[PDB]
Structure formats: structure tokens, C-alpha cells
Amino acid sequence: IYTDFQMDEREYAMEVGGAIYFAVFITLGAFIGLNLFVVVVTTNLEQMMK
Amino acid sequence: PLSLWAGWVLDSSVFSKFIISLIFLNTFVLMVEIELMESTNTALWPVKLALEVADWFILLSFIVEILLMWLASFSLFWKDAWNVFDFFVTLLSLLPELVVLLGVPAHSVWLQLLRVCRVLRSLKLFARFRQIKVILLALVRALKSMTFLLMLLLIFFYIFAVTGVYFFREYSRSTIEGLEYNMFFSDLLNSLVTVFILFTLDHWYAVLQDIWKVPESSRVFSSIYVILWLLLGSIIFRNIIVAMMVTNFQNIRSELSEEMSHLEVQYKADMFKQQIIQRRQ
Amino acid sequence: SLRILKLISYSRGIRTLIIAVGETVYTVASVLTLLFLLMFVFAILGFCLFGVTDRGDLENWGNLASAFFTLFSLATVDGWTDLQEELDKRKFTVSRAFTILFILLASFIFLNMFVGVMIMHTEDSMKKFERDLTLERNLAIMEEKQIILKRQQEEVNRLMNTQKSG
Amino acid sequence: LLGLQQMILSLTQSLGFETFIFIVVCLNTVILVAQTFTELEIRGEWYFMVLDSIFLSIYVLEAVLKLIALGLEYFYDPWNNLDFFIMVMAVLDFVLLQINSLSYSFYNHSLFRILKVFKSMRALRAIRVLRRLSILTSLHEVAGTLSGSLPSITAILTLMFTCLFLFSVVLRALFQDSDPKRFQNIFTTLFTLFTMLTLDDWSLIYIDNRAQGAWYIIPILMIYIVIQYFIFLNLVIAVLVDNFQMALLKG
């Protein structure tokens, strides 16, 4: 996908802005989702040990 | 003077503000100069040279900083805490001036390593916050607790890598013209690199399809070996390290809670003895 | 490498770590059996969805071993983009929905369940060991205090006896 | 029209803000989710921006009412500050389209996309003001327990920013005259570092750097990758696990 939207202007264009926007969105969403998943799992396993 | 002057310039807020301002100005200026060193803008060429020479002036400020450090305990400071590492980094950052004055840097200059060393020293001596130092203390005590788990990790890496050296031997040592992952399994260091790649688990599907160009000998031993190695090593090691990390957080919080409980018990005893003293009077 | 394993069979510290993590063998075997059952279910599903029609997609959802390896790759994160680009051209629009459902089930369940299970197991296994060590230190401390008290009582009794006899 | 106007504005603001704002914002988000919808814009594209401008006029009426209202207490609310910023950009792009003439480029330019993402965050504001009722207590509690430990995650993301900037600086320094076409500038260098952190074709980078003459850059990149990846995931996973774990230990 990075090569797919590459070469908008070859210097900045939207290739800087939109890319950093959805990149920080991707990293935040992925970290939050993985953390929430492991949190729910360890929560229900603490319920199991209780 | 001497130590008294050093204490005064450490206590004065104007000197601290000036040095931190120079530090973050130098860090901001540093990566600008590497962008363009050509005649694209003939008006800004002398001021860019003046900015590089302002960086040289920041290095001179580092020499007068180590003069203020000589005003301190002098010979006792040669073996100390991270301040001696900072002194060594400042010496390594003074070194490029000497190696461009007399070294003729048309060679392996290694100026970039010293530059990034002084950059990391500036990024560490930035008046780190309380919320940085608490998690840094947690991280350093975690790496102190990293005693035997790391040798277990490296020795399992060692045994599995040297096992997998001569398993897909007919991958790199084959006469197939069209292949592009043959470099992965050629050398022992290459074997270390490729089993590290398998450990990080990136494009393991593509790696398996590229090794599939080897004549398929009913996959009875090799493919199951590499798949079991990557799966077991990745999940087991990531899992034991995260389990020990949450255990470190658990015992840190348990120590904090028991300290607070002891403080509350001591306060209760203090107030009880205050009532005792008041009745005794 | 087996000889090197015999070398590392020493180090009583590693042996204590092995003992401390050795009670989770049944748990990891149970999760492995669950994950194997999930591979079997989606193996027969992927075969029935893409290999019986025999209009392409061979050696990905076709032969059993290649199908199993592709399912393992899809349960991991690797190769999913190229696998999706391979499967969306086989005139099966719901294949993409089935594969993303398989990802959000298998990858999340396996990874998160394993990390949670091992995190609780190691936490509760370390907790009892540390509690027992602190308890043994406590018994040693009380034994030392009782020895000191007995020595003080014996000294007081000897002093009183010497005072009475002198 | 002093304090008397203020209290009349308060009571009638409660009433008309409950009644009028809800229905017009519901219609605004209905027409906006019909607007985005990249199939039905060709079934339209003329009944779309007229309604968009009409509801932008409704939103600037909301801004006028909030400006004539109590003022500083409204400015204290960060969401209302975002509303003020929204309406500043909305009146800016509205008058920019209204004046016409001009001397710069047009016909779906980067400025037009800036106005489009402004319309998008206006739609986000409409969504966030429709959820005054029934946000659901289960996910309310989940969001509160997630947002409880904010200093810790800010500290850890600051440590990432420092470490990633250091790694990008050293990689750009060691990659001079080393086919830097993929990372020739600041943005591309930091994007390659982001891919490096997010495990995207670093094996490919190793195999196409072996085609080059430099080999020692691969162990350095490898060790930086593993230390930053281990340290960050482990820190955040443990931090958020405990962050929900004291909430678990409580009621």
C-alpha cells in the first residue's frame, strides 16, 4: 500500500500528511486493540483463578 | 572560587536555562545542516556555515563545561556514575574537531557515531521528568531481574540456529538459477540472521514458499522443524518475558502498598501515643 | 546441539526456572490441542470452500500439507496480504469475509489467550515461591529471637544464682 | 441585555438546544453519511453541497448563539474550543468559495482536500454531539478504566519518540551515499524507521542491503529493532494490564 500511494509529488504533496495521519492512527489503534485484548483475557483468567 | 563557583553556576537558574536552551538549539540545528550543503540557496550558504560554526561554538561551550567540571573534585570524578559517561561522550564530541584539524577526513571518519553519541547525551540531559525517571527505575530494575532468562533465550537461539544450519542445506547449496532467499541459509552468521527473522516472525509465509523451491522430500522433518521452532520460540519467549514483566510490576506495587500500610500503622501508633502523652500530662 | 543441551542441563538456577515453569505443560498442551482443533476445522472448511471446486487456488487450500501451512500463516500475520490477493481472483467474494473472520478469530484468540494464561500462571507460581521464601526468613528471624531470649534468660538465671551463692 | 439576557439565554438555551440542535444535527449527519458514501455522490453531487452549505449555515448559527451566550465558561470547555476552531475553518472555507475569482489553483486541489477533511471532523463533531444520550455504562466504565493511566502511556510514547528519533538520526547518518532513495529526506527516513518498528519487510531490507556493499548495518539495525520492539511492547502491555488490574481488584 505504501508503494501504491507513493509518488504523489515525490517530495511532499499529500504523501507526507495523509501518510503520517493514517500511520499514527494505525499504530495507536493496533496498540490499543492488542492491549485491550490481552487485558480482557487476563481479566477473565483472574476471574477463573478466583 | 573553584567548587564554590561550580555550585553557584549550578544553583543559578539563568545558567541552567542558558545551557538547556543551547542544548535543544544544537539538537534542532544539527539535522538541518545535513539536508543541503550545495548552491541551491547562495544567500543562506554563509549563514548555514555560521550555523555549523555555532555548533562548533556549542562544542567550545562543552569545553568550558568540562572546565567547570575540573573546578569540581577533579581526580575523584574520573570514576563515578553516568556523569563520567557524559564526560566521555563530551570528549568523543570534541574529537571531531581534532580529526578535521589534523586527520584529513577523506577516510572512514566515524564522525557520525560521535555525533549521535553527543545527540543521545543531549537527549538524556534534558531535565528528565518524574514520569520518565520512575519508569526508567522500573526498567533498570527489570533488567537487573533479567539474570537467567536472557541466557536461556540466547542459548535456545544458539542451539536452534546451529541445528538449522545443516537442515535446509540443499536450499543455498543447490544449482537452481532462480532463487532470491538463498543468501539466508548460506553462512552461520546468515543462519543467525534468518532464525532471528523467524523469531521476529515477519513474512514467514513468504520464507516458507521460497524454501518450497527445494525438491519436496515429503516435508517429514525439515518444514515441521522450522515451523515448530519459530512458533514455540516466539510464543514461549515473548510470553515468559511479558509474564516476568507483569510480575515485576506486581512486586513493585506490592512493595509500595506494604510501605504505605506500614506508614499508616506507624501513624496510628503515633496518634495513640499522642493520646497517651496527653493523658500522662 | 543435543550435546550442547546436555551442557546446559547444568546451572541449577536454570533448573529452578524449569521447575517454576514446569507446571504449565498441561496448560500449553491444552491450548495446543485447541489450536490444532481450530486448524482442523478451518482446514476442512478451506478445502471444501476452495479446493473441491478445482477452479484454481491449488497448493493453498488444495493439498492437505500446503493447506495446513497456509492456514498457519493466516493464523499468524505473515503472508495474509499476498494470500488475499491470490484468493480474491477465484470468483469468491465472500472468501475475503471468511478470511478476515478467520483472522479476527484465530490470531486474536490464540495470541491473547496464550499470553494471558502464561501471565497468570507465572504470576501465581512466583507469588507462592516468594511468599514461602519470606515465610522461611520469618521463621529464621523468630528462631534467632527465641535463641537470644533463651540466652538472656540463662544469663539472668546464672547471675541470680551467683548472687545468691555469694 | 445583561445578566437578565444571560439567564434568559441559559433557560432558552437548555430548551432550544435540547429540541432544535438534536434534530438538525441528526439530519446533518444523515446527509453527511449519504454524502461521503463513494457510490451515491454521482447519484447527486448537486443536492449534496447545497444541503452541506445549508447545514454549515445552521452550524454558524450555533456559533453565533454560543458567542452571544455566556462566553468564557463556554471557552473553558475543550470540546467547545474545538467547536470554535471548526466554525473558524468553516467560515474561512465558505467565504473562500463565495468570493470566487482568486488567483490560485482549484478544481479539487490539496486545499479542497483540506476543506474535505474539515468537513470530516465536522461530521465527527456531529457524531460526538448526538451521543449525549445512551452512551452505555459498560463501555463508559471501560473507557474510564482505559483512560485512567494516562501519564504512564504518555511517558512510554515519549520514550518511543526519543528512541525512534535517535535511531532515525543514526540510520540516516550511516546511510549516506548508500542508495538512500528510499529515505532521502526527513519524512522518508522516519517512515522507514516506522516500518522498521512495525515489522514491515525488514527481511526484505536485509536481503536488498546484502546486494549492497555494506553488511555491518544489518546487525545494528537488527539489534535496534529487537531492543525497541521488546522494550515497548512489554512496557505498554504490562502497564495497561496492571491499569485494568487494580480496577479488577476493586469493585
Side-chain angles (χ1 to χ4, degrees):
Chain A
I1 318 291
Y2 183 45
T3 48
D4 209 308
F5 64 75
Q6 215 86 69
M7 322 157 136
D8 289 294
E9 178 195 61
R10 166 67 274 174
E11 193 180 89
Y12 303 129
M14 292 155 158
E15 194 180 348
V16 279
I20 65 142
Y21 291 162
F22 88 89
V24 303
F25 157 70
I26 274 172
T27 201
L28 166 69
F31 291 152
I32 283 294
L34 190 129
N35 287 143
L36 272 173
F37 289 158
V38 310
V39 161
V40 165
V41 164
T42 190
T43 283
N44 293 268
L45 292 169
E46 192 39 72
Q47 305 311 99
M48 182 205 68
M49 320 285 178
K50 282 308 278 317
Chain B
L2 297 135
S3 52
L4 165 84
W5 202 351
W8 186 57
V9 302
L10 276 161
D11 173 61
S12 52
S13 285
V14 282
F15 199 82
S16 278
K17 188 65 207 91
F18 212 104
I19 62 177
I20 66 168
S21 299
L22 287 181
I23 279 294
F24 63 65
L25 163 153
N26 165 70
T27 59
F28 194 62
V29 157
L30 182 127
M31 194 199 169
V32 172
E33 311 311 301
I34 212 64
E35 176 196 319
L36 264 166
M37 202 173 147
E38 296 103 289
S39 158
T40 55
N41 42 347
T42 196
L44 293 193
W45 158 67
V47 75
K48 267 167 194 181
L49 282 178
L51 228 50
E52 289 261 47
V53 177
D55 307 341
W56 298 128
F57 156 74
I58 305 290
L59 285 188
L60 264 279
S61 163
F62 293 152
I63 327 166
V64 300
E65 273 316 298
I66 78 180
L67 282 180
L68 300 182
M69 285 297 187
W70 304 136
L71 298 186
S73 315
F74 210 47
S75 61
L76 189 58
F77 224 87
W78 201 263
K79 278 180 109 142
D80 211 46
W82 294 68
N83 287 357
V84 71
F85 257 44
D86 303 340
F87 171 70
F88 195 51
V89 168
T90 52
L91 182 58
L92 290 156
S93 85
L94 179 76
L95 262 171
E97 256 291 304
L98 307 165
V99 315
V100 304
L101 206 42
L102 216 64
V104 195
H107 49 53
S108 170
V109 192
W110 278 22
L111 193 146
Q112 289 81 30
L113 174 84
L114 323 167
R115 206 210 290 116
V116 86
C117 276
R118 82 199 207 225
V119 160
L120 80 94
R121 190 195 39 83
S122 299
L123 212 36
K124 186 93 191 213
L125 276 189
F126 78 119
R128 27 196 294 278
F129 218 80
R130 76 59 181 168
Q131 61 107 41
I132 296 297
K133 45 162 161 153
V134 288
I135 208 63
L136 187 42
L137 273 153
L139 203 57
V140 298
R141 75 167 300 280
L143 71 95
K144 290 340 175 191
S145 73
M146 301 335 297
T147 319
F148 259 61
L149 305 109
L150 255 178
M151 29 204 167
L152 196 68
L153 192 132
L154 69 94
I155 209 73
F156 285 178
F157 155 79
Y158 177 38
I159 61 138
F160 270 96
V162 307
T163 322
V165 168
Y166 292 150
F167 250 85
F168 279 130
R169 216 199 40 82
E170 214 211 343
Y171 187 32
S172 309
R173 291 127 293 261
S174 271
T175 74
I176 289 296
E177 253 313 298
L179 266 174
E180 64 102 6
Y181 275 179
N182 265 1
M183 162 46 210
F184 276 60
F185 277 65
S186 64
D187 207 24
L188 167 83
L189 189 125
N190 303 352
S191 151
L192 303 196
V193 167
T194 190
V195 301
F196 257 117
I197 284 150
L198 290 178
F199 199 64
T200 88
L201 265 188
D202 50 306
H203 271 201
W204 96 267
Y205 182 60
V207 159
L208 168 61
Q209 306 324 299
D210 221 354
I211 308 175
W212 270 127
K213 320 290 170 216
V214 179
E216 175 177 336
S217 59
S218 314
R219 72 114 199 178
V220 76
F221 70 100
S222 56
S223 77
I224 196 74
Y225 155 75
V226 287
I227 281 173
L228 189 96
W229 142 242
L230 58 92
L231 191 44
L232 284 199
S234 314
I235 71 187
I236 281 304
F237 281 129
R238 174 204 65 243
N239 227 332
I240 179 63
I241 302 304
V242 299
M244 180 302 320
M245 182 37 49
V246 301
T247 321
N248 284 331
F249 220 104
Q250 293 304 70
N251 55 65
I252 282 160
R253 158 160 27 77
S254 83
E255 230 205 319
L256 266 157
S257 296
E258 79 98 19
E259 284 167 287
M260 181 82 201
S261 160
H262 175 264
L263 255 296
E264 285 294 272
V265 163
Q266 284 286 117
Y267 208 67
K268 288 300 160 295
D270 186 78
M271 81 58 60
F272 186 44
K273 96 183 59 164
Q274 280 276 355
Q275 288 176 344
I276 287 172
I277 288 174
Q278 282 164 341
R279 180 44 49 203
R280 273 185 175 183
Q281 263 175 321
Chain C
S1 159
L2 295 172
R3 283 135 85 102
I4 300 193
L5 276 165
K6 192 150 157 283
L7 211 175
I8 315 300
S9 271
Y10 280 87
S11 312
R12 281 136 44 162
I14 308 184
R15 210 187 324 275
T16 50
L17 324 164
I18 281 159
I19 289 300
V21 308
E23 77 278 330
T24 76
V25 176
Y26 311 130
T27 68
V28 301
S30 318
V31 184
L32 218 74
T33 50
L34 260 162
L35 166 58
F36 264 56
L37 291 190
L38 183 60
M39 301 146 177
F40 221 85
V41 170
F42 224 93
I44 214 59
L45 275 161
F47 170 58
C48 295
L49 278 178
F50 316 110
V52 201
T53 170
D54 282 305
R55 57 164 184 205
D57 219 324
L58 215 57
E59 282 165 27
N60 317 120
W61 318 106
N63 214 358
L64 216 61
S66 62
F68 264 72
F69 296 155
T70 51
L71 287 144
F72 194 40
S73 81
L74 214 56
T76 63
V77 293
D78 302 355
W80 143 245
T81 58
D82 48 81
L83 193 42
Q84 190 260 343
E85 299 298 324
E86 191 260 311
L87 61 93
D88 48 31
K89 330 271 184 184
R90 223 59 66 191
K91 314 301 140 205
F92 216 80
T93 319
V94 85
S95 54
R96 164 171 68 135
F98 283 158
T99 45
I100 64 192
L101 281 181
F102 170 65
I103 288 163
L104 72 95
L105 174 56
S107 67
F108 292 154
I109 280 310
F110 143 76
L111 278 158
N112 309 137
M113 218 44 186
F114 217 54
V115 298
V117 156
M118 168 28 48
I119 272 175
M120 323 331 290
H121 274 100
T122 314
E123 151 153 17
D124 287 345
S125 80
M126 300 314 108
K127 156 192 130 53
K128 295 299 285 266
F129 291 158
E130 294 266 22
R131 274 199 155 177
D132 285 334
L133 284 161
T134 49
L135 186 126
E136 187 255 351
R137 187 53 194 273
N138 274 332
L139 273 91
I141 284 173
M142 311 325 178
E143 276 188 352
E144 280 204 350
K145 278 158 160 164
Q146 186 60 233
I147 282 173
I148 282 181
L149 274 168
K150 281 170 182 177
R151 184 79 181 149
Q152 185 255 345
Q153 282 181 330
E154 279 178 338
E155 282 172 352
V156 163
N157 260 340
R158 282 157 198 160
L159 272 163
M160 252 205 219
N161 280 332
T162 49
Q163 278 168 330
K164 281 176 187 179
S165 49
Chain D
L1 276 210
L2 288 327
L4 167 52
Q5 173 73 20
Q6 296 304 315
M7 82 55 55
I8 286 307
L9 265 175
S10 315
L11 181 72
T12 61
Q13 172 258 7
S14 318
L15 258 174
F17 202 92
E18 200 264 353
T19 59
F20 290 119
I21 303 292
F22 269 68
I23 53 182
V24 306
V25 166
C26 212
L27 205 42
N28 203 351
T29 176
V30 158
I31 68 144
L32 256 51
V33 304
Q35 200 161 10
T36 56
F37 220 75
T38 85
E39 172 59 52
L40 273 181
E41 80 295 348
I42 74 171
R43 196 57 93 82
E45 196 225 356
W46 294 7
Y47 214 79
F48 274 22
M49 42 290 279
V50 285
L51 265 299
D52 187 75
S53 307
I54 283 309
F55 280 94
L56 277 157
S57 92
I58 305 308
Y59 270 8
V60 84
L61 293 195
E62 302 187 359
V64 156
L65 197 51
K66 288 302 131 285
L67 179 124
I68 212 172
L70 315 95
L72 183 73
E73 175 54 43
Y74 271 134
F75 285 136
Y76 141 76
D77 178 44
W79 307 92
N80 286 336
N81 303 133
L82 291 183
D83 305 341
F84 156 75
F85 187 56
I86 278 180
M87 291 334 307
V88 154
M89 282 157 328
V91 301
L92 179 123
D93 77 9
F94 187 47
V95 303
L96 172 131
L97 296 194
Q98 266 183 134
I99 56 166
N100 253 358
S101 164
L102 287 156
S103 276
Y104 331 110
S105 169
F106 257 83
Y107 208 53
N108 314 106
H109 207 64
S110 38
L111 313 173
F112 161 74
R113 205 264 314 134
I114 293 280
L115 319 191
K116 212 178 186 103
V117 299
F118 287 168
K119 294 179 191 44
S120 178
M121 42 78 69
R122 155 217 200 194
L124 172 63
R125 175 56 34 75
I127 288 295
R128 92 98 196 158
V129 300
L130 287 185
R131 40 145 276 279
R132 203 259 287 137
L133 68 150
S134 168
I135 170 169
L136 279 89
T137 48
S138 165
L139 68 103
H140 221 101
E141 175 88 9
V142 162
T145 38
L146 152 63
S147 39
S149 195
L150 191 125
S152 51
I153 56 181
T154 51
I156 300 303
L157 69 92
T158 310
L159 292 191
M160 299 332 115
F161 283 159
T162 53
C163 288
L164 259 296
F165 287 157
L166 284 163
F167 289 158
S168 158
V169 158
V170 69
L171 276 206
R172 181 87 186 275
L174 284 160
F175 274 155
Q176 78 285 62
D177 305 325
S178 305
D179 45 277
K181 211 182 91 195
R182 203 198 264 99
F183 54 85
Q184 92 271 5
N185 67 305
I186 42 168
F187 148 77
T188 42
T189 313
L190 79 97
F191 222 89
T192 46
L193 254 292
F194 180 69
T195 63
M196 260 316 167
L197 185 71
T198 57
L199 208 78
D200 283 296
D201 286 312
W202 87 273
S203 201
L204 258 297
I205 294 310
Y206 150 68
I207 196 52
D208 87 326
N209 279 349
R210 192 47 197 80
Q212 305 151 35
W215 59 84
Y216 33 74
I217 199 55
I218 293 311
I220 291 289
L221 167 84
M222 191 285 258
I223 193 63
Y224 284 171
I225 278 173
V226 296
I227 63 152
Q228 72 200 111
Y229 144 92
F230 291 137
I231 284 309
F232 177 77
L233 56 99
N234 186 236
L235 269 164
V236 187
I237 281 167
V239 152
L240 264 157
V241 154
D242 68 65
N243 176 21
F244 265 79
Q245 163 255 323
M246 87 308 313
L248 249 56
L249 286 192
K250 307 187 307 261

